[PDB]
Amino acid sequence: MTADLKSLAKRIYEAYLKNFNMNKVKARVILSGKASNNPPFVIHDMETLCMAEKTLVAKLVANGIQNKEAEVRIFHCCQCTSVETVTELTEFAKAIPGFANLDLNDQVTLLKYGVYEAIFAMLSSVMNKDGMLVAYGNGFITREFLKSLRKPFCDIMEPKFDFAMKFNALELDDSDISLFVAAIICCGDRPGLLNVGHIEKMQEGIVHVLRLHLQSNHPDDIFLFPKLLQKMADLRQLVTEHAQLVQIIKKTESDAALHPLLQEIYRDMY
Ligand SMILES: CC(C)(Oc1ccc(C(=O)c2ccc(Cl)cc2)cc1)C(=O)O
Ligand SMILES: CC(C)(Oc1ccc(C(=O)c2ccc(Cl)cc2)cc1)C(=O)O
């Protein structure tokens, strides 16, 4: 692990810390309850949802969502969070060496297919087996409450929890996750790329730094890099299924609206 490779890892780590409001260190501090006796407000049923939404009234009233079905309200708010994360991933990508120099349409394409893989990767940091932190760690929506919603909404998040439990068992830290997210974005085989050669060059550099970083930071998890290559493949499959579910909601749910700022990402994705 050469000094230049360590420096690239720390600079990507820095960009990740400066661009994402929530990181795994903060998440685990809250989920563990060590730094405080004031835990997040728990949304575990329809009544505690409605209580939480008293705080979120202005968010709901903004788009006239407040009289919608609870399932629609919940995932309106979740969409708003995705849009926020997409904005942060877009700034973060500037710190990947070479990304900003790519053809603008290639940057758009890399983000189009990459953001949700990174989103579900990073979501793992705010999940445990019982639920997920929401609202910058201030609330906690239980896994069972999400499974209790009417179909198809009860099937949206459960496969993300299933992915996260195995991902979290890898015990990645934020230095690892920042390079993983960088590697997710630099995939050379997204549909519609223009300069595949330039991108593969950029990808090989990030994947090389990632492998050596993992070997240095988790010396006792010898095949951690191969394990994370498989997670990258699992995430691409997870996102493909998510897109198909989004498509089914679009076709079968009349009163649910796809956030303007996510319509373009999903348009013709898979
Ligand atoms: C500033 C504030 C409160 O920031 C939020 C950040 C994240 C979320 C969520 O992701 C969320 C999703 C579903 C529920 Cl049920 C509750 C919360 C909501 C609000 C807002 O924008 O009003
Ligand atoms: C992770 C998340 C929030 O997952 C979704 C979950 C539910 C919906 C919807 O409720 C919906 C509403 C209208 C349409 Cl047309 C399609 C879907 C959208 C995305 C995302 O992808 O950011």
mmCIF file of C-alpha atoms and ligand atoms in Angstrom:
data_model
loop_
_atom_site.group_PDB
_atom_site.id
_atom_site.type_symbol
_atom_site.label_atom_id
_atom_site.label_comp_id
_atom_site.label_asym_id
_atom_site.label_seq_id
_atom_site.Cartn_x
_atom_site.Cartn_y
_atom_site.Cartn_z
ATOM 1 C CA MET A 1 0.000 0.000 0.000
ATOM 2 C CA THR A 2 1.939 2.980 -1.391
ATOM 3 C CA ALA A 3 1.709 6.494 0.087
ATOM 4 C CA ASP A 4 -0.147 7.787 -2.970
ATOM 5 C CA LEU A 5 -2.762 5.031 -2.708
ATOM 6 C CA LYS A 6 -3.288 5.783 0.996
ATOM 7 C CA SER A 7 -3.706 9.478 0.158
ATOM 8 C CA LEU A 8 -6.329 8.723 -2.491
ATOM 9 C CA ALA A 9 -8.230 6.602 0.059
ATOM 10 C CA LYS A 10 -8.193 9.371 2.675
ATOM 11 C CA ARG A 11 -9.252 12.035 0.145
ATOM 12 C CA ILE A 12 -12.221 9.925 -0.961
ATOM 13 C CA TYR A 13 -12.931 9.260 2.727
ATOM 14 C CA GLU A 14 -12.882 13.040 3.285
ATOM 15 C CA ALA A 15 -15.258 13.714 0.382
ATOM 16 C CA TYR A 16 -17.633 11.055 1.727
ATOM 17 C CA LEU A 17 -17.614 12.561 5.246
ATOM 18 C CA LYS A 18 -18.175 16.072 3.885
ATOM 19 C CA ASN A 19 -20.991 15.174 1.497
ATOM 20 C CA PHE A 20 -23.189 12.703 3.393
ATOM 21 C CA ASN A 21 -25.177 13.962 6.369
ATOM 22 C CA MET A 22 -25.322 10.491 7.958
ATOM 23 C CA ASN A 23 -22.362 8.131 8.275
ATOM 24 C CA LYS A 24 -21.876 4.763 9.926
ATOM 25 C CA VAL A 25 -20.049 6.091 12.991
ATOM 26 C CA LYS A 26 -22.940 8.418 13.873
ATOM 27 C CA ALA A 27 -25.513 5.751 12.985
ATOM 28 C CA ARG A 28 -24.003 3.091 15.259
ATOM 29 C CA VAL A 29 -23.613 5.610 18.096
ATOM 30 C CA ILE A 30 -27.380 6.223 17.954
ATOM 31 C CA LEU A 31 -28.445 2.601 17.442
ATOM 32 C CA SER A 32 -26.257 1.517 20.362
ATOM 33 C CA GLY A 33 -27.496 4.186 22.781
ATOM 34 C CA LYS A 34 -24.114 4.750 24.409
ATOM 35 C CA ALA A 35 -23.732 8.538 23.968
ATOM 36 C CA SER A 36 -27.222 9.441 25.155
ATOM 37 C CA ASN A 37 -30.378 8.347 26.964
ATOM 38 C CA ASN A 38 -32.623 10.196 24.462
ATOM 39 C CA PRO A 39 -33.270 7.608 21.721
ATOM 40 C CA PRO A 40 -34.896 8.289 18.344
ATOM 41 C CA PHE A 41 -38.660 8.466 18.242
ATOM 42 C CA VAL A 42 -39.904 5.010 17.233
ATOM 43 C CA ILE A 43 -42.473 4.638 14.436
ATOM 44 C CA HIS A 44 -43.852 1.120 15.005
ATOM 45 C CA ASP A 45 -47.556 1.464 14.095
ATOM 46 C CA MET A 46 -50.130 3.720 12.473
ATOM 47 C CA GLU A 47 -50.584 5.841 15.605
ATOM 48 C CA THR A 48 -46.875 6.607 16.143
ATOM 49 C CA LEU A 49 -46.601 7.277 12.394
ATOM 50 C CA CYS A 50 -49.306 9.939 12.684
ATOM 51 C CA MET A 51 -47.538 11.397 15.732
ATOM 52 C CA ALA A 52 -44.247 11.635 13.830
ATOM 53 C CA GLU A 53 -46.088 13.212 10.879
ATOM 54 C CA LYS A 54 -47.199 16.065 13.127
ATOM 55 C CA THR A 55 -43.533 17.091 12.983
ATOM 56 C CA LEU A 56 -43.462 16.457 9.226
ATOM 57 C CA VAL A 57 -46.715 18.343 8.545
ATOM 58 C CA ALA A 58 -45.013 21.043 6.419
ATOM 59 C CA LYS A 59 -43.231 18.400 4.322
ATOM 60 C CA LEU A 60 -46.531 16.624 3.698
ATOM 61 C CA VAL A 61 -48.542 19.812 3.112
ATOM 62 C CA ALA A 62 -45.884 21.105 0.696
ATOM 63 C CA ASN A 63 -47.038 18.658 -2.001
ATOM 64 C CA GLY A 64 -50.597 18.090 -0.801
ATOM 65 C CA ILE A 65 -49.656 14.604 0.474
ATOM 66 C CA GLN A 66 -51.236 15.038 3.920
ATOM 67 C CA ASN A 67 -54.591 13.366 3.125
ATOM 68 C CA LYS A 68 -53.051 10.482 1.181
ATOM 69 C CA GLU A 69 -52.998 6.885 2.393
ATOM 70 C CA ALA A 70 -50.340 6.214 5.043
ATOM 71 C CA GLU A 71 -48.319 4.019 2.640
ATOM 72 C CA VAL A 72 -48.175 6.858 0.128
ATOM 73 C CA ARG A 73 -47.103 9.398 2.757
ATOM 74 C CA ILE A 74 -44.353 7.139 4.124
ATOM 75 C CA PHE A 75 -42.760 6.603 0.744
ATOM 76 C CA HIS A 76 -43.220 10.177 -0.357
ATOM 77 C CA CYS A 77 -40.940 11.093 2.539
ATOM 78 C CA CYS A 78 -38.571 8.233 1.613
ATOM 79 C CA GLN A 79 -38.404 9.503 -1.954
ATOM 80 C CA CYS A 80 -37.446 12.951 -0.637
ATOM 81 C CA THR A 81 -34.611 11.294 1.255
ATOM 82 C CA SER A 82 -33.430 9.456 -1.869
ATOM 83 C CA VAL A 83 -33.421 12.768 -3.791
ATOM 84 C CA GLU A 84 -31.255 14.285 -1.048
ATOM 85 C CA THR A 85 -28.820 11.347 -1.194
ATOM 86 C CA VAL A 86 -28.689 11.542 -5.007
ATOM 87 C CA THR A 87 -27.684 15.205 -4.693
ATOM 88 C CA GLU A 88 -24.936 14.257 -2.229
ATOM 89 C CA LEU A 89 -23.685 11.351 -4.359
ATOM 90 C CA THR A 90 -23.470 13.784 -7.285
ATOM 91 C CA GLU A 91 -21.157 16.088 -5.331
ATOM 92 C CA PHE A 92 -19.191 13.135 -3.942
ATOM 93 C CA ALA A 93 -18.520 11.788 -7.441
ATOM 94 C CA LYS A 94 -16.495 14.930 -8.234
ATOM 95 C CA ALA A 95 -13.772 13.658 -5.864
ATOM 96 C CA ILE A 96 -13.259 10.436 -7.824
ATOM 97 C CA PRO A 97 -10.127 11.111 -9.942
ATOM 98 C CA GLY A 98 -11.191 11.366 -13.572
ATOM 99 C CA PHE A 99 -14.954 11.548 -13.002
ATOM 100 C CA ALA A 100 -15.247 15.306 -13.529
ATOM 101 C CA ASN A 101 -13.226 15.032 -16.776
ATOM 102 C CA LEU A 102 -15.599 12.481 -18.337
ATOM 103 C CA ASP A 103 -18.114 13.293 -21.049
ATOM 104 C CA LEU A 104 -21.061 14.971 -19.327
ATOM 105 C CA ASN A 105 -23.442 12.328 -20.704
ATOM 106 C CA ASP A 106 -21.159 9.623 -19.289
ATOM 107 C CA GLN A 107 -21.265 11.258 -15.854
ATOM 108 C CA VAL A 108 -25.066 11.317 -16.103
ATOM 109 C CA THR A 109 -25.125 7.663 -17.125
ATOM 110 C CA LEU A 110 -22.766 6.559 -14.357
ATOM 111 C CA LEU A 111 -24.921 8.315 -11.759
ATOM 112 C CA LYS A 112 -28.179 7.072 -13.305
ATOM 113 C CA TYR A 113 -27.287 3.420 -12.732
ATOM 114 C CA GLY A 114 -24.991 3.942 -9.751
ATOM 115 C CA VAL A 115 -26.891 6.129 -7.261
ATOM 116 C CA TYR A 116 -29.370 3.494 -6.106
ATOM 117 C CA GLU A 117 -26.711 0.809 -5.667
ATOM 118 C CA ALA A 118 -24.846 3.294 -3.474
ATOM 119 C CA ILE A 119 -28.098 4.308 -1.754
ATOM 120 C CA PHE A 120 -28.898 0.737 -0.720
ATOM 121 C CA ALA A 121 -25.256 0.151 0.238
ATOM 122 C CA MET A 122 -25.267 3.220 2.516
ATOM 123 C CA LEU A 123 -28.778 2.532 3.837
ATOM 124 C CA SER A 124 -27.247 -0.516 5.522
ATOM 125 C CA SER A 125 -25.431 1.836 7.900
ATOM 126 C CA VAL A 126 -28.707 3.097 9.388
ATOM 127 C CA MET A 127 -30.352 -0.355 9.581
ATOM 128 C CA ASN A 128 -30.371 -3.091 12.188
ATOM 129 C CA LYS A 129 -32.448 -6.279 12.254
ATOM 130 C CA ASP A 130 -35.385 -4.390 13.818
ATOM 131 C CA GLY A 131 -35.655 -1.182 11.766
ATOM 132 C CA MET A 132 -33.949 1.831 10.231
ATOM 133 C CA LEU A 133 -33.041 5.326 11.324
ATOM 134 C CA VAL A 134 -34.886 8.144 9.527
ATOM 135 C CA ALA A 135 -34.721 11.952 9.603
ATOM 136 C CA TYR A 136 -30.945 12.191 10.123
ATOM 137 C CA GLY A 137 -31.026 9.625 12.915
ATOM 138 C CA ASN A 138 -33.869 11.284 14.878
ATOM 139 C CA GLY A 139 -36.525 8.652 14.140
ATOM 140 C CA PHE A 140 -36.573 4.870 13.856
ATOM 141 C CA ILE A 141 -39.132 3.044 11.697
ATOM 142 C CA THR A 142 -39.496 -0.595 12.621
ATOM 143 C CA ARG A 143 -39.017 -3.411 10.143
ATOM 144 C CA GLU A 144 -42.242 -5.127 11.260
ATOM 145 C CA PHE A 145 -44.245 -1.931 10.767
ATOM 146 C CA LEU A 146 -43.035 -1.755 7.163
ATOM 147 C CA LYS A 147 -43.933 -5.443 6.664
ATOM 148 C CA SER A 148 -47.436 -4.698 8.014
ATOM 149 C CA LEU A 149 -48.308 -2.189 5.280
ATOM 150 C CA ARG A 150 -50.669 -3.295 2.536
ATOM 151 C CA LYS A 151 -49.167 -4.857 -0.566
ATOM 152 C CA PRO A 152 -47.195 -3.837 -2.617
ATOM 153 C CA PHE A 153 -45.721 -1.286 -0.171
ATOM 154 C CA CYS A 154 -44.845 -3.919 2.470
ATOM 155 C CA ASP A 155 -42.489 -5.590 -0.045
ATOM 156 C CA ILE A 156 -40.378 -2.495 -0.836
ATOM 157 C CA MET A 157 -37.949 -2.266 2.096
ATOM 158 C CA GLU A 158 -37.787 -5.853 3.407
ATOM 159 C CA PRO A 159 -35.267 -6.974 0.705
ATOM 160 C CA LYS A 160 -33.127 -3.957 1.605
ATOM 161 C CA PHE A 161 -33.091 -5.080 5.254
ATOM 162 C CA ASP A 162 -32.235 -8.583 4.045
ATOM 163 C CA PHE A 163 -29.318 -7.189 2.041
ATOM 164 C CA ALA A 164 -28.194 -4.951 4.924
ATOM 165 C CA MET A 165 -28.015 -7.665 7.594
ATOM 166 C CA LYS A 166 -25.456 -9.626 5.571
ATOM 167 C CA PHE A 167 -23.656 -6.472 4.452
ATOM 168 C CA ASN A 168 -23.428 -5.207 8.058
ATOM 169 C CA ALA A 169 -21.959 -8.547 9.180
ATOM 170 C CA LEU A 170 -18.900 -7.593 7.084
ATOM 171 C CA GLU A 171 -18.205 -4.858 9.683
ATOM 172 C CA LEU A 172 -17.166 -2.239 7.126
ATOM 173 C CA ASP A 173 -16.283 1.215 8.404
ATOM 174 C CA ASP A 174 -16.735 4.575 6.686
ATOM 175 C CA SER A 175 -13.232 4.468 5.194
ATOM 176 C CA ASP A 176 -14.190 1.164 3.513
ATOM 177 C CA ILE A 177 -17.678 2.321 2.544
ATOM 178 C CA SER A 178 -16.423 5.505 0.871
ATOM 179 C CA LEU A 179 -14.221 3.484 -1.525
ATOM 180 C CA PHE A 180 -16.998 0.944 -2.085
ATOM 181 C CA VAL A 181 -19.403 3.731 -3.106
ATOM 182 C CA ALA A 182 -16.713 5.225 -5.341
ATOM 183 C CA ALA A 183 -16.247 1.801 -6.959
ATOM 184 C CA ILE A 184 -20.008 1.418 -7.463
ATOM 185 C CA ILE A 185 -20.103 4.718 -9.369
ATOM 186 C CA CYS A 186 -17.161 3.918 -11.698
ATOM 187 C CA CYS A 187 -18.712 0.785 -13.235
ATOM 188 C CA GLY A 188 -17.433 0.323 -16.773
ATOM 189 C CA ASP A 189 -20.425 -1.680 -18.051
ATOM 190 C CA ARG A 190 -23.375 0.660 -17.623
ATOM 191 C CA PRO A 191 -25.680 0.798 -20.665
ATOM 192 C CA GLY A 192 -25.045 3.753 -22.937
ATOM 193 C CA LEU A 193 -21.475 4.627 -21.969
ATOM 194 C CA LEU A 194 -19.465 6.590 -24.541
ATOM 195 C CA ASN A 195 -15.812 6.269 -23.473
ATOM 196 C CA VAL A 196 -15.739 2.812 -21.909
ATOM 197 C CA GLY A 197 -11.941 2.779 -22.044
ATOM 198 C CA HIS A 198 -11.557 5.959 -19.984
ATOM 199 C CA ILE A 199 -14.045 4.701 -17.396
ATOM 200 C CA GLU A 200 -12.438 1.267 -17.047
ATOM 201 C CA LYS A 201 -9.129 3.056 -16.475
ATOM 202 C CA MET A 202 -10.813 5.101 -13.727
ATOM 203 C CA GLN A 203 -12.519 2.002 -12.311
ATOM 204 C CA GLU A 204 -9.296 0.002 -12.178
ATOM 205 C CA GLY A 205 -7.723 2.738 -10.061
ATOM 206 C CA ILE A 206 -10.550 2.850 -7.522
ATOM 207 C CA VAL A 207 -10.901 -0.957 -7.329
ATOM 208 C CA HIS A 208 -7.138 -1.252 -6.852
ATOM 209 C CA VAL A 209 -7.161 1.272 -3.983
ATOM 210 C CA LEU A 210 -10.217 -0.463 -2.520
ATOM 211 C CA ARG A 211 -8.609 -3.918 -2.559
ATOM 212 C CA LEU A 212 -5.397 -2.746 -0.890
ATOM 213 C CA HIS A 213 -7.319 -0.587 1.576
ATOM 214 C CA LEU A 214 -9.388 -3.599 2.636
ATOM 215 C CA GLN A 215 -6.277 -5.784 2.923
ATOM 216 C CA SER A 216 -4.673 -3.129 5.149
ATOM 217 C CA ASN A 217 -7.746 -2.206 7.207
ATOM 218 C CA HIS A 218 -9.216 -5.724 7.679
ATOM 219 C CA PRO A 219 -6.102 -7.935 7.550
ATOM 220 C CA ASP A 220 -7.932 -10.759 9.343
ATOM 221 C CA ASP A 221 -10.853 -10.806 6.827
ATOM 222 C CA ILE A 222 -8.632 -12.187 4.108
ATOM 223 C CA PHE A 223 -11.194 -12.441 1.260
ATOM 224 C CA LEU A 224 -13.165 -9.321 2.193
ATOM 225 C CA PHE A 225 -12.468 -7.754 -1.211
ATOM 226 C CA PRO A 226 -13.942 -10.759 -3.099
ATOM 227 C CA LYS A 227 -16.923 -10.719 -0.693
ATOM 228 C CA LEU A 228 -17.543 -7.052 -1.555
ATOM 229 C CA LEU A 229 -17.284 -7.757 -5.278
ATOM 230 C CA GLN A 230 -20.178 -10.147 -4.755
ATOM 231 C CA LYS A 231 -22.134 -7.482 -2.833
ATOM 232 C CA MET A 232 -21.682 -5.145 -5.787
ATOM 233 C CA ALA A 233 -23.325 -7.826 -7.922
ATOM 234 C CA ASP A 234 -26.070 -8.329 -5.322
ATOM 235 C CA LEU A 235 -26.753 -4.590 -5.265
ATOM 236 C CA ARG A 236 -27.128 -4.422 -9.055
ATOM 237 C CA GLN A 237 -29.670 -7.234 -8.796
ATOM 238 C CA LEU A 238 -31.359 -5.542 -5.808
ATOM 239 C CA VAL A 239 -31.666 -2.300 -7.797
ATOM 240 C CA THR A 240 -32.997 -4.115 -10.885
ATOM 241 C CA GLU A 241 -35.746 -5.665 -8.760
ATOM 242 C CA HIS A 242 -36.446 -2.335 -7.040
ATOM 243 C CA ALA A 243 -36.873 -0.618 -10.428
ATOM 244 C CA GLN A 244 -39.325 -3.369 -11.442
ATOM 245 C CA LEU A 245 -41.275 -2.798 -8.234
ATOM 246 C CA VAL A 246 -41.326 0.977 -8.808
ATOM 247 C CA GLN A 247 -42.717 0.205 -12.274
ATOM 248 C CA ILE A 248 -45.512 -1.952 -10.831
ATOM 249 C CA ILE A 249 -46.545 0.756 -8.365
ATOM 250 C CA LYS A 250 -46.563 3.289 -11.211
ATOM 251 C CA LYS A 251 -48.970 1.053 -13.168
ATOM 252 C CA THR A 252 -51.274 -0.110 -10.337
ATOM 253 C CA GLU A 253 -51.405 2.761 -7.793
ATOM 254 C CA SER A 254 -53.371 5.753 -9.046
ATOM 255 C CA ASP A 255 -52.799 8.137 -6.115
ATOM 256 C CA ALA A 256 -49.003 7.760 -5.735
ATOM 257 C CA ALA A 257 -46.699 10.211 -7.529
ATOM 258 C CA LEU A 258 -43.073 9.621 -8.538
ATOM 259 C CA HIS A 259 -40.921 12.494 -7.295
ATOM 260 C CA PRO A 260 -40.053 14.763 -10.268
ATOM 261 C CA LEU A 261 -36.356 14.552 -9.451
ATOM 262 C CA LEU A 262 -36.331 10.701 -9.567
ATOM 263 C CA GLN A 263 -38.446 10.212 -12.711
ATOM 264 C CA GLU A 264 -35.415 10.743 -14.943
ATOM 265 C CA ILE A 265 -33.268 8.224 -13.031
ATOM 266 C CA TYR A 266 -35.873 5.493 -13.421
ATOM 267 C CA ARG A 267 -36.871 6.334 -17.023
ATOM 268 C CA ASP A 268 -35.695 3.412 -19.201
ATOM 269 C CA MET A 269 -33.311 2.175 -16.504
ATOM 270 C CA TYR A 270 -33.776 -1.597 -16.685
HETATM 271 C C1 LIG B 1 -36.205 18.216 7.890
HETATM 272 C C2 LIG B 1 -36.989 16.917 7.697
HETATM 273 C C3 LIG B 1 -37.605 16.606 9.067
HETATM 274 O O1 LIG B 1 -36.093 15.921 7.274
HETATM 275 C C4 LIG B 1 -36.516 14.602 6.996
HETATM 276 C C5 LIG B 1 -35.525 13.695 6.682
HETATM 277 C C6 LIG B 1 -35.831 12.381 6.396
HETATM 278 C C7 LIG B 1 -37.144 11.962 6.428
HETATM 279 C C8 LIG B 1 -37.469 10.513 6.097
HETATM 280 O O2 LIG B 1 -36.779 9.891 5.359
HETATM 281 C C9 LIG B 1 -38.722 9.877 6.663
HETATM 282 C C10 LIG B 1 -39.358 8.957 5.853
HETATM 283 C C11 LIG B 1 -40.508 8.343 6.294
HETATM 284 C C12 LIG B 1 -41.014 8.665 7.535
HETATM 285 CL CL1 LIG B 1 -42.507 7.845 8.038
HETATM 286 C C13 LIG B 1 -40.384 9.591 8.355
HETATM 287 C C14 LIG B 1 -39.221 10.206 7.917
HETATM 288 C C15 LIG B 1 -38.158 12.857 6.724
HETATM 289 C C16 LIG B 1 -37.842 14.175 7.012
HETATM 290 C C17 LIG B 1 -38.053 17.148 6.618
HETATM 291 O O3 LIG B 1 -37.751 17.015 5.397
HETATM 292 O O4 LIG B 1 -39.225 17.458 6.952
HETATM 293 C C1 LIG B 2 -36.123 3.783 -1.997
HETATM 294 C C2 LIG B 2 -37.285 4.473 -2.708
HETATM 295 C C3 LIG B 2 -37.896 5.516 -1.742
HETATM 296 O O1 LIG B 2 -38.194 3.478 -3.141
HETATM 297 C C4 LIG B 2 -39.484 3.882 -3.511
HETATM 298 C C5 LIG B 2 -40.546 3.402 -2.780
HETATM 299 C C6 LIG B 2 -41.832 3.753 -3.134
HETATM 300 C C7 LIG B 2 -42.067 4.585 -4.210
HETATM 301 C C8 LIG B 2 -43.511 4.967 -4.534
HETATM 302 O O2 LIG B 2 -44.326 4.957 -3.675
HETATM 303 C C9 LIG B 2 -43.918 5.347 -5.945
HETATM 304 C C10 LIG B 2 -44.765 6.416 -6.176
HETATM 305 C C11 LIG B 2 -45.116 6.736 -7.478
HETATM 306 C C12 LIG B 2 -44.622 5.980 -8.531
HETATM 307 CL CL1 LIG B 2 -45.039 6.360 -10.221
HETATM 308 C C13 LIG B 2 -43.777 4.922 -8.291
HETATM 309 C C14 LIG B 2 -43.420 4.601 -6.994
HETATM 310 C C15 LIG B 2 -41.006 5.078 -4.949
HETATM 311 C C16 LIG B 2 -39.713 4.722 -4.595
HETATM 312 C C17 LIG B 2 -36.680 5.164 -3.926
HETATM 313 O O3 LIG B 2 -36.748 4.588 -5.043
HETATM 314 O O4 LIG B 2 -36.121 6.296 -3.824
#
